[PDB]
């Protein structure tokens, strides 16, 4: 109704190969007659849920998988229905990233991880550790250059260092991703954020460095190193910098742990072109020729399609992408990921600016992210409990609540508040419900 029928509108981030994708759209148009329009609006990961909630937006949305769980929970994405033959063409782990509540909600395209990118002319052997970067910066500053510049405004770029000694922020429990009790607040994360803030205090980095500033400095030969994903490689090729792409530096002997995003393509639930979207994604884009057209414009990283990934396997930059991906953490796709990112973004900005100490910044981020994630799991458990009818199951839930004493009885009901329960009681209800055969 609001979205035009008989054509496809695709949204993809401005840093990705939207011109290469438009070439795949011209191939679709040449074969089928259907026009494909590719757009890259600003802040599309936020603009998409705003317009799709009103039945508007693109037919197809491209973004890393982390945001798709939140879109699916709001009813914004159509369930995808590839057959076994198509599913067998992509790596099984890529399908896991786009599965939400038992259903596939997007087509996985590529596996993205940040790497350390360095200028071989300024730095033939890149540093293996973060600890050696302050003295390296001093040496390069005497020659008119800096050691490292990377986007400090987005938590995606600073998280690898924070999590190097901090470890993974999330864990899998009772059929769901849960943020750890100290996934953001631990001493290792505090050490990582302190190291980053100390780099700024010692004038080795600037708190206002953003994506454009870092990209221009590296591509103009002003800084020996940057941190970026595969999409950035084309702009460095154009600049003629002799670069290497390698493992991120270690911190306290621990590998840096980037969040691994699976660039994925979802179909808007309001689209009147769901079958055309499926044909374009399965038969045009997710082929060697389709992925090559996008890849030639801006590299995708380690693609989800087995056949084309084998043709990209010999690229040393992809081997580095995969090595960093293995050391990092696959992003969860739960709806609270939005709150997790807002909280870490705020902690890094406040620590780097002196608004808060490192300890206060991460303690507050842990509270904000864990409260939102826990609230979502409580809302879901409340929904789940309210549909149960079977006597044995209800008796056992009530038996578990009775052990705590956190309940009240009225003339007609047995009452309790999920918010007044301890997390161990909530975990026992979740564990019992997982065994009851009900969902």
């Amino acid at each position: 109704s609001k979205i035009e029928e008989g054509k496809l509108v695709i949204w993809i981030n401005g840093d990705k190969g939207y011109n290469g994708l438009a070439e795949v759209g011209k191939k679709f148009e040449k074969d089928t007659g259907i026009k494909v329009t590719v757009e890259h609006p600003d802040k599309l990961e936020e603009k998409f849920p705003q317009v799709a909630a009103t039945g508007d937006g693109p037919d197809i949305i491209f973004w890393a998988h982390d945001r798709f769980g939140g879109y699916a929970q709001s009813g914004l994405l159509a369930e995808i229905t590839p057959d076994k033959a198509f599913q067998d063409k992509l790596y099984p782990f890529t399908w896991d990233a786009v599965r939400y509540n038992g259903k596939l909600i997007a087509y996985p395209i590529a596996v993205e991880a940040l790497s350390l990118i360095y200028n071989k002319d300024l730095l033939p052997n890149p540093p293996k550790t973060w600890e050696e970067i302050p003295a390296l910066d001093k040496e390069l500053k005497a020659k008119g250059k800096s050691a490292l510049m990377f986007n400090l405004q987005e938590p995606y770029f600073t998280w690898p260092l924070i999590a190097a000694d901090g470890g993974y922020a999330f864990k899998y429990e009772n059929g769901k991703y849960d943020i750890k009790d100290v996934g953001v607040d631990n001493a290792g994360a505090k050490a990582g954020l302190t190291f980053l803030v100390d780099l700024i205090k010692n004038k080795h980095m600037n708190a206002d460095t953003d994506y454009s500033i870092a990209e221009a400095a590296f591509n103009k030969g002003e800084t020996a190193m940057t941190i970026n994903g595969p999409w950035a490689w084309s702009n460095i090729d154009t600049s003629k910098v002799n670069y290497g792409v390698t493992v991120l530096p270690t911190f306290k002997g621990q590998p840096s742990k980037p969040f691994v995003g699976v660039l994925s393509a979802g179909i808007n639930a309001a689209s009147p072109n769901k079958e055309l979207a499926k044909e374009f994604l399965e038969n045009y884009l997710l082929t060697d020729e389709g992925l090559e057209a996008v890849n030639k414009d801006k590299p995708l990283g380690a693609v989800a399609l087995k056949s084309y990934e084998e043709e990209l396997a010999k690229d040393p930059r992809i081997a580095a992408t995969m090595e960093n991906a293995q050391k990092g953490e696959i992003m969860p796709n739960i709806p609270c990921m939005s709150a997790f990112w807002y909280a870490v973004r705020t902690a890094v900005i406040n620590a780097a600016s002196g608004r808060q100490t490192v300890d206060e910044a991460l303690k507050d981020a842990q509270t904000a992210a864990a409260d939102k994630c826990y609230l979502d799991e409580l809302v879901e458990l409340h929904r789940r409990l309210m549909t149960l009818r079977e006597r044995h199951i209800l008796q056992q839930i009530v038996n578990l609540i009775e052990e705590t004493g956190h309940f009240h009885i009225t003339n007609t009901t047995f009452d309790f508040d999920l918010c007044s329960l301890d997390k161990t009681t909530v975990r026992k209800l979740q564990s019992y419900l997982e065994t009851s055969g009900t969902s």
């Binding site: 809302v379 409340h382 009885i409 009901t413 047995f414 009452d415 918010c419």
Partner: peptide, 7 residues
């Protein structure tokens, strides 16, 4: 999040 079960 109050839950009510039939008594």
């Amino acid at each position: 999040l109050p839950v009510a079960a039939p008594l």
